[PDB]
Amino acid sequence: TTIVSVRRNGHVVIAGDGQATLGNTVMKGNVKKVRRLYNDKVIAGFAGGTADAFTLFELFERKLEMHQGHLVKAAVELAKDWRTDRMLRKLEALLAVADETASLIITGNGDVVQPENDLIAIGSGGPYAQAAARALLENTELSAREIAEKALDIAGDICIYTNHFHTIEELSYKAEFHHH
Amino acid sequence: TTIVSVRRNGHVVIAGDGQATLGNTVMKGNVKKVRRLYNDKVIAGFAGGTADAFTLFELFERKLEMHQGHLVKAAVELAKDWRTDRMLRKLEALLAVADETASLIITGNGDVVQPENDLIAIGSGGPYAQAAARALLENTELSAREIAEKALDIAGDICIYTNHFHTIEELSYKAEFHHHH
Amino acid sequence: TTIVSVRRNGHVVIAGDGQATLGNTVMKGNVKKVRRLYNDKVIAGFAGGTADAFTLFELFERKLEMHQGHLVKAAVELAKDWRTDRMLRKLEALLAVADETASLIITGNGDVVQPENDLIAIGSGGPYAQAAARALLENTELSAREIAEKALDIAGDICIYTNHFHTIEELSYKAEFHHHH
Amino acid sequence: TTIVSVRRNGHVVIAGDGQATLGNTVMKGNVKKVRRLYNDKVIAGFAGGTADAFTLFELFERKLEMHQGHLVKAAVELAKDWRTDRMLRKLEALLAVADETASLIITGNGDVVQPENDLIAIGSGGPYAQAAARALLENTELSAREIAEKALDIAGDICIYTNHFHTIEELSYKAEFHHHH
């Protein structure tokens, strides 16, 4: 499992593979690890098992409406409850979330984090992709999209636990407004 | 324990062995791991111990009537409660369910899944069978039945934890065919 | 790493992938795990690291000329020395060898084995491929080649440790197949 | 600890040893592991510690009267509560129960099971006795009694954790055997 995010110009993206590895056998390989929340305003990607993710995303989206649209806080409030009540302390995963606002990793442990460049790379191959992505983003242009794609690809070429099937979600936000 | 499912033309099947392995001794070897729910409309197979299964199947079938016959949903609602209340969080198993609608694995963990081809292979030998099955389904015709049977056989030939005694349930619903000449 | 062998009509084949997995990172993925010995008369496939293999293949090929072309014996003599002198007792791998004569797995442990059908399936994915292969070979024709290929493919689709890059070697030993287009 | 059950003609029996092993020292060796419930209509044997057993037997016998005399159900209802509420989830043991109705293993895990022949063999030596018993029951007649006894004896001869002191309970439910001296 591997997921990335990038922010270039007016585009932020989250992209993950879909390999359902188990033990040493792929049980499935097209899981949508990336999806969107709060009516197409905020994107996210989770690492782990669909359930916990869903429970979290919901709860998080709850904390979302419960704070209007302040991503940061919604996330924060969530991370709290998560690394709080004994129950949630059981569900484990990692959530990459982003929107016009910003991007942030949320771990079950209790850690809400804005990476060093809205460059979220997580999962088994996170490091690998990160590197690639980074490299690109550093020594080249291309789009958030292209890069993520690119890196997220390479990831799986190295980390066995990664798929190659790309679920992606990107939202542009160039507030181009022509008065006539 | 191993269980498969397939869907070819107008036939979907679920087939499992019956080996009651314990530690390293077979206590029994004719357990019906596959059965049918909601008055012969939906089939299922569970992996694990009869009890939990029964508790789940019932609860699931409750969530079933409680949504008419929308398999997906019923399953979804179930997986919820399962990977929800601390109590159910104790019963562990895997449920392979199918019908005209579709087929889906339901884990206790909280995971409702449509495999990559309504090809459900679970249990110790799941991977093995899957392979065989797949292979067949790929490079040959035959029936959902034949295939499942075939694979589910091979499974036990390799995975010690698998039986060879085949409990099967298949439901047809729009029997197709594809003959050439 | 996964390697298969099959024997159908006048064709015996050995085919393996090429994934150089390490820890949880692929360092390379095009290793030729399958090759031929004794001047294109005997084929083999090894599971593990190039070196040990080479050491073994050579020593084995030595025990080969040292017994003319009696595959069985060459293999037997080898497995002995292997699971014998302290030194060799360190190099570990698995050797799938075949020719007109037959096919046999050679383990470092000290085991020379003719599988249940000259159907050699070894490696992380061995079981998987075996299954598929088997299934094919059972419920269909096709060639030793097609099957191995097919299975060895499927293998990697399931076992992460398997590559998909196919190194194959097949030797025919009778026939004169024709083609009418 | 080892316990068996058999059903031959009109006789079902449960027999266990009495070795109170602990660590690697026998603290006692005459524990009655087999007993009867519901006013001499149903027999049972437990594997483990007197307490949990008693707690279970009682609760089970409660679920018993609470369903008249339908052994199966009583057992089922019990296994549920057992592999249900956190509390019971702690008491661990195995219950071999039988009567005119049938015989069934009840595990704390959540598993109510009718063995392959009303041949219940449980405990450290269970497998061993099962074997012997089985063998007898297969290639000979004798009584449920004789067999159980026999097997349950042999058990201890092999499994150190087994006693040799036989607590047995058998209930007949038809017949009128005679004797001409």
Add this chain to the structure above:
Amino acid sequence: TTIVSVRRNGHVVIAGDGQATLGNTVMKGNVKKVRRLYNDKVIAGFAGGTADAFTLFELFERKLEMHQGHLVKAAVELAKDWRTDRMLRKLEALLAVADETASLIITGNGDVVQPENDLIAIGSGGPYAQAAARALLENTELSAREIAEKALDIAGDICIYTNHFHTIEELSYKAEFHHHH
């Protein structure tokens, strides 16, 4: 892997299954674990891997001719060298040997043993079979053959590591009988 031996009237037998289990996958299941030595005078069964066995059987048979036909001795001398020189100290297995003379287990460890009744039961299932066998041999007649067969069957029914495919070798030498009337 499981192997038995029995001696009734004028017949001593050695019988073993043929399951080539590895890890948790059967690589083969028709290995001849039982065979005969010294020109059809002495039988044996080995537990483990064909190679080591062969090395031992040969060496043992060497120690055999080297002592005429005194099984005991040959065996003794063998066990010596086996649990002696560092090299042999690596090959591990168990040898069940018998003939007119007697029957004896030979372990690599250095142990030549006459079981408690020329009833050799070894291998994963050894204990199981033993039991059954014993039981038979105790509470019934039948032949060394029938018994062994019977037991060796049951074995695999319980011990997953056992095959069911029976390789047997029995030698008669003063065929008795005991009929009553």
Add this chain to the structure above:
Amino acid sequence: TTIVSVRRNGHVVIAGDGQATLGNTVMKGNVKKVRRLYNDKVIAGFAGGTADAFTLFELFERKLEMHQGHLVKAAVELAKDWRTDRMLRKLEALLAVADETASLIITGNGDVVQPENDLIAIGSGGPYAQAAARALLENTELSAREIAEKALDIAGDICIYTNHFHTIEELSYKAEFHHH
């Protein structure tokens, strides 16, 4: 720690040492491991730590009055609660209890047991003492007292974890009643 019990003629005894071993250092060596309950009618010995013991003995003595003087049951009821509620499931020890009625080991695990001869031998050296005791009781007379003493002595001579300081409690019950 080691404790024994014996029953000969009209005398039942419980005797234990007093070694407070810890790690590999004796912190104390005169702990009274044996004592009496229910107003000098029932004796007992515990193995382990004074606290848990006290909690148990009390609770047990509670279950005692709560059943008049039926040792067996009191014990049984106790063993239940002990190997029952999560809380008690934490306190661990072994209780040797006896009286006119009988003698019985009660473990936390959930096990109430009448040994093979009202010969209770428990603790690190239990086995050892048992043996000796047994031997005596088998091939000689002497008193319950003498034997226990004897054995309980030997125990410590072998098991390092045993003390040699003997706390003993014996109750006779020969209902000798002269009518005049």
Add this chain to the structure above:
Amino acid sequence: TTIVSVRRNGHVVIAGDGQATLGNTVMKGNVKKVRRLYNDKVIAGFAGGTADAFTLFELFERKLEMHQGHLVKAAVELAKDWRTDRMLRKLEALLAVADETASLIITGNGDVVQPENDLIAIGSGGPYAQAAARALLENTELSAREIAEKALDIAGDICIYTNHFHTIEELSYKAEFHHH
């Protein structure tokens, strides 16, 4: 496995059971663990596996003739080589040896020991038997034989790993010499 030795008046004895326990299954139960060396002059008992024992007994008996009949030294020289050359360092067991001279435990580790009373108790049940034996030997007479027997019996009654089948060897040495 359990073996004892005793020395009373002019009789020294070694006695062991014969249980061939393995894992948790008795493979055999009549192994002769006790035997005699150097032409019926010295007795011994081994704990473990027949082979190693034989190798040792032989080597030891070699070191025996190689020192005339000085048990002690023979034993000592042996224990050396045993807990010496890498090879022997692999064979593990315990040897109880005795004769007119004395009695002594020899471990592979490198330890030749005369117990506290020519009372050798070794093996799984050694401690147990020891106790019993001791007890007897302490508070009663009877013979070395009777006691060993007795104790060695009790042993198996407690230690599951012990058999009950008694192989015994006792040598008397009362140099009663009547001049006529």
Add this chain to the structure above:
Amino acid sequence: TTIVSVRRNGHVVIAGDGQATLGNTVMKGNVKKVRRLYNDKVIAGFAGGTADAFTLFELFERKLEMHQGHLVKAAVELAKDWRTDRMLRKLEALLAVADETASLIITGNGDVVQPENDLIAIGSGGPYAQAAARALLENTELSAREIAEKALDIAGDICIYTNHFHTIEELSYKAEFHHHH
């Protein structure tokens, strides 16, 4: 992660790095581990994960207003609740807090501590920095600031888990320093 504090003349400082190490990969490296509470009167630094910290800082700042401005007490009351209710017993971290009043380490374990010199050195590198810091503070003057900086730098040069990105907060509470150029 590493954090220091010093008190020299009228200046107390808290400074930490910003390395977000995980496993053996830096996920981020600019985390503000040091911050200020109770309206710029009290400073603090936490070791660990942002969340728990925040939960604690808040609760502590609650216990702060709830005792006016008596740092010591606020801290004490906090450490209590922390190493008290089961819930808080889960959040783990270390809090370095200081102000005009004093400086004190607060551990989840239940320990409120004033170091040996208002010289708080905590975190993976704490010991290292402490040393350096100490050494400076001992054999030289410079400012609390310069020292912390200096040491906290050196820290990362040695402890891989330390960043080098310095988040610092210093509060003076007397003086009027001048400068003649």
Add this chain to the structure above:
Amino acid sequence: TTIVSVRRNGHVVIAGDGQATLGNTVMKGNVKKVRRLYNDKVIAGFAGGTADAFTLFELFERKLEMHQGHLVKAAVELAKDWRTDRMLRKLEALLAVADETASLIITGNGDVVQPENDLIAIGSGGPYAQAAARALLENTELSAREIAEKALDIAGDICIYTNHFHTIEELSYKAEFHHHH
């Protein structure tokens, strides 16, 4: 951490070091582990972390006033609540307490103990000190003070976890003496 107590003539003392060891680094080394309660009538020493200690001392001192001045009792009542309510069951430490009445160790586990000579030696070095102390107290006179000091010194000389900085509290109450001539 190490603490001692002694009682000679009319003087009882409690003395402990002050090493704040953590992992393998001293974070502080002047912690007052010994202090006095109930208005200079009762002394005590705790082993562990200041917090828990304080919680206990207070609660204990509460149980103190709540029983006038009967040390024993107060202690007993305390040990109860301590090794009682789940909450307190978390705070762990050891309390050495003494006064005119007597001296007693109180563990969280639930254990109130009068050592073998009002000679309380606890903590990492407890055993060591005890020894020395004992030795002195045995083969010499000197004062409770001197001895404690002496021993408590030696302790740190051996046990790395011990400080050398001595916090002591001694209360006289009927000052004896024993001079000869």
Add this chain to the structure above:
Amino acid sequence: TTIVSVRRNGHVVIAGDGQATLGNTVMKGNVKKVRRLYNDKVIAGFAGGTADAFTLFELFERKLEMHQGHLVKAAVELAKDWRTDRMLRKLEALLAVADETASLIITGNGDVVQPENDLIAIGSGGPYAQAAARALLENTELSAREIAEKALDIAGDICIYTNHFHTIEELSYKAEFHHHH
């Protein structure tokens, strides 16, 4: 096992207990752990098993005559060979040796050491005795003898692994003590 040494005026002593502890059972308790070498000129004590000791003492005494009577060197040369050739590298123990010359601990590891005061305290209880001994030697006179005895006694009172049976060897090397009754 515990052994001490002291040097006071013209007397150096080595004293050890005799507890043959094994696992958790004393197999013997009168082993002479202390003895004398080189014709009553040098004393020593070993910690461990009689054999290795003897091997060492001999070899050391060889290195002794091989250097006349220079204890230090003999010891040094020994420790070398000991922590040198693979073989000796297996025998493990500790040797306390002394004479007119001096006293020194010799470990198998490769360490020849003169303690801080010719006060050798080794063995499980070494630390304990050391303490006591020390304390005596510090705050009192008495003889090397009395002290060792005293301490070595106390040792066993605390360390279970220590005996109480005292084997002692003391050599004087000046003086002419008198006694007026």
Add this chain to the structure above:
Amino acid sequence: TTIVSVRRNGHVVIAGDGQATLGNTVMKGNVKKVRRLYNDKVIAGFAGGTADAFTLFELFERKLEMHQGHLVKAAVELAKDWRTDRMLRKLEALLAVADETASLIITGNGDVVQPENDLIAIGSGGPYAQAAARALLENTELSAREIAEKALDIAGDICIYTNHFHTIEELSYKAEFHHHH
């Protein structure tokens, strides 16, 4: 155990503590870990046990004369033989060596190293001292001596395994200075 080295102006120093820690008890605490070789021209410090050190120092000093006075080389040649012949491969330690030439750590592993500033800090506390030392050397002047002393002090203040008793050896060789005014 901790040892440092520094080089300032015309002075290079090596300084180590003297704590003989064992398990968790100091057996001695005045071991001279630092000493000089090749007739007062080269200094060194070893970490570990006196023996091995001595063996090495000698052998190294042999390799020293055997190359005149080229420290580097001598060291190199030594490290070779050390991390070479199986025998030396057993003695383990660390050698800090210096002289006019330079300073270098020599590990048994096979590693001759010039630290980043002739600032050798090794041993348990090595890191700690290094830090301090470094800090000094960085933000202050003072002498190689003062610094080492200072740091090597601090070390033991933190690392329990360090002594405080300072054995030092410094050699001047072109005494510089740098005064300003």
